[PDB]
Symmetry: none
């Protein structure tokens, strides 16, 4: 009769019958691979109802493959693997470094689909690029807690008596073709105490324009006046603010 | 042949030894009364002569000031320093003791006034001053009460420095002048012990010396996680250098 019966049973595949058990001549039935199965590229996935109520032949066209290789931050799959989804056991794909990573020549940038349907063990075939030597801050310091490779953070400080002007930290971030420091080296600026206080009936010996950390100012009483107190005071520096060590002496008469 | 009572001398009293009759050749001496001093080169005694007659005697006592009171700034010059006769109008001169100096604008003279008192005393001899103390590098000099003869000053070293030498000085008289009893001490920077090294980590840019408030920053080697403070600083546990705390640790991952 001008109709075929049920199409052939294909291992690991299911046909789309659309609710019927009888099919007219020239009917084309397509099979879909079952769960955990991927169709083999370049193979038929359908049958056709021919004359004599006979279906055309069809061979197993499904496998048995690894999942799409897991997403790496250091490397991306090369072409053509990057567009593929069929990875039977034994399949080896190749990677290439992303930015800002570079190849570790001693290591293979390849992964193999194993018998258990899993990709081989991942090694660091693509490593983190390094940022330039951070250098130095005059009268300050640079803290490098964990190297200077891509993704690293460094911090800046100014020594006692100096004030930081600029950025307090920097990060090694990807910059176009390479990796560079997010921020430039800041500046450590000398902290000045307020102008030293004058005293009644006394003077400052050779008063300077500016007083920095630990610098001192010496007092002297005018003729006929007696000194009572510290002959000199010095500049203390805390939390980036200058402040004299204590009050200036007194010059009492007479 | 015995004389009777000797003559009455104004402002003087004779020493009679309770006697009222005196044999020939008896010599009687008079003593000036209070406030009076005998006049140098004048007779103060009489002698009983023949004819039961005393020899003549004239007033020999002049009202006089007392020996000038002792001053600590100056001493009487010669010859006043050995004198005791100071009638009204007498002016004596002083000279400075050590460690005092003359106040040029003033007179070093005292006059015996009509009331038998010496004129008002002024500071004609003033205390000498020791030289300016100077400065102590990284330290301070406290001058509580001037730098004149007898004064005391004290020395201290700023935070982070240790005093080596004298802690005070006193303005002493030294021969022909006044000088500080002790020379200035020195203020030397205190150093903390060398910072400790840590397993699997380093000291970032270690220095040869660390002083007060100076810090040392640590960093762990690749593949280790730091545990504890990243940097420590040089404190001064008086008067010793000491690190603020233990260095961090590096734990292998």
């Amino acid at each position: 009769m001008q109709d075929c019966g049920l199409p052939p049973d294909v291992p690991n595949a299911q046909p789309a019958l659309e609710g019927r058990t009888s099919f007219p001549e020239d009917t084309v039935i397509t099979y879909k691979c079952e769960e955990s199965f991927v169709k083999i590229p370049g193979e038929k996935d359908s049958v056709i109802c021919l004359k004599g109520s006979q279906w055309s032949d069809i061979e197993e066209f499904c496998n048995r493959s690894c999942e799409v290789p897991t997403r790496l931050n250091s490397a991306s799959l090369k072409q053509p693997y990057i567009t593929q989804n069929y990875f039977p056991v034994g399949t080896v794909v190749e990677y290439e470094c992303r930015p800002g990573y570079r190849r570790e020549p001693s290591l293979s940038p390849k992964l193999t689909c194993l018998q258990n349907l899993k990709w081989s063990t991942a090694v660091e075939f693509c490593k983190k690029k390094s940022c330039p030597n951070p250098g130095e801050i005059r009268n300050g310091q640079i803290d490098v807690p964990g190297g200077i490779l891509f993704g690293a953070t460094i911090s800046f400080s100014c020594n006692t008596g100096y004030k930081l002007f600029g950025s307090t930290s920097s990060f090694c971030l990807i910059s176009g073709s390479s990796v560079q420091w997010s921020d430039p080296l800041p500046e450590c600026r000398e902290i000045y105490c307020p102008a030293p206080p004058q005293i009644d009936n006394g003077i400052i010996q050779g008063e300077r324009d500016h007083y920095g950390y630990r610098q001192s100012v010496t007092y002297a009483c005018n003729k006929g006046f007696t000194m009572i107190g510290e002959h000199s005071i010095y500049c203390t520096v805390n939390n980036d603010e200058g402040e004299w060590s204590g009050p200036p002496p007194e010059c009492r008469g007479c």
